[PDB]
Amino acid sequence: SLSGVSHVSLTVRDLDISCRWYTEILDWKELVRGRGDTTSFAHGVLPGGLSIVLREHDGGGTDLFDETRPGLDHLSFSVESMTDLDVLEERLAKAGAAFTPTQELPFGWILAFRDADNIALEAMLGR
Amino acid sequence: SLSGVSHVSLTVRDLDISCRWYTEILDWKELVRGRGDTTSFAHGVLPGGLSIVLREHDGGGTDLFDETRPGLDHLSFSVESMTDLDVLEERLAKAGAAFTPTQELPFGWILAFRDADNIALEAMLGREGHHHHHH
Numbered sequence: 001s002l003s004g005v006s007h008v009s010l011t012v013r014d015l016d017i018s019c020r021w022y023t024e025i026l027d028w029k030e031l032v033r034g035r036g037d038t039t040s041f042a043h044g045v046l047p048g049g050l051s052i053v054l055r056e057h058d059g060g061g062t063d064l065f066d067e068t069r070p071g072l073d074h075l076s077f078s079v080e081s082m083t084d085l086d087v088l089e090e091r092l093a094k095a096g097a098a099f100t101p102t103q104e105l106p107f108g109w110i111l112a113f114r115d116a117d118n119i120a121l122e123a124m125l126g127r
Numbered sequence: 128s129l130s131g132v133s134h135v136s137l138t139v140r141d142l143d144i145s146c147r148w149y150t151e152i153l154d155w156k157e158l159v160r161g162r163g164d165t166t167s168f169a170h171g172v173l174p175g176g177l178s179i180v181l182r183e184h185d186g187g188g189t190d191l192f193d194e195t196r197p198g199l200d201h202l203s204f205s206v207e208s209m210t211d212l213d214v215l216e217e218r219l220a221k222a223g224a225a226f227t228p229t230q231e232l233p234f235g236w237i238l239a240f241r242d243a244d245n246i247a248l249e250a251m252l253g254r255e256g257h258h259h260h261h262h
Contacts, residue, residue: 001154001173001206002153006203006251008132008199011199011200047129048130061197063197066184070140075135080128080130084128
């Protein structure tokens with residue numbers, strides 16, 4: 001049957017800028033780079049093994065991510081301990097990224113942040 | 128350390144339509160639906176454990192899924208056997224959904240399809256180290 005996620009492909013405004021951001025913030029490791037007919041991409045993997053492909057589409061506007069547009073509302077990553085969240089907050093702050101400090105909720109702790117294109121991301125330590 | 132995807136929250140034009148679509152196509156099972164500040168949501172889980180939250184924004188439904196816009200380009204699921212792909216194609220066809228026949232590639236087989244909001248999805252089966260091409 002269906003097991004899980006093979007990989008998530010995210011559209012970014014500037015490949016290079018996003019590659020650096022994901023590398024610095026989430027330890028994303030670029031494996032290969034490439035060029036499509038109307039796009040440029042970078043396939044990378046996060047600690048834990050999750051595959052994340054960043055894709056820049058030709059002649060894209062300046063337009064940022066918008067939760068109200070069909071597609072991604074937000075992507076939530078699972079972490080192993082509170083330390084992971086502390087480290088993320090430290091990296092986010094140092095990069096001057098937008099983020100709301102870890103909040104404790106009924107089902108766990110959530111750290112909500114935004115990438116270089118305002119894409120809504122979260123890191124959660126579940127109970 | 129980061130350990131993968133906790134869950135994926137998708138923005139959809141019509142919550143009810145999407146719930147039925149995901150239930151019927153991917154055996155998504157709704158665990159609870161509620162109301163947020165400016166949204167309606169339904170949290171469900173897929174076979175294999177992946178959590179998917181469907182979310183309808185009160186002020187949404189005017190723009191279309193557009194992979195050229197920041198956010199999701201496409202979401203690819205891992206499947207265990209060819210039969211999983213065969214079943215998906217059958218369901219997609221029966222439902223009159225948008226999809227292309229499963230394609231055989233060097234490193235595996237991929238079934239590309241769209242949900243009710245045209246969001247780009249894929250089902251993937253690996254080749255190397257398996258015997259799916261030996262039957």
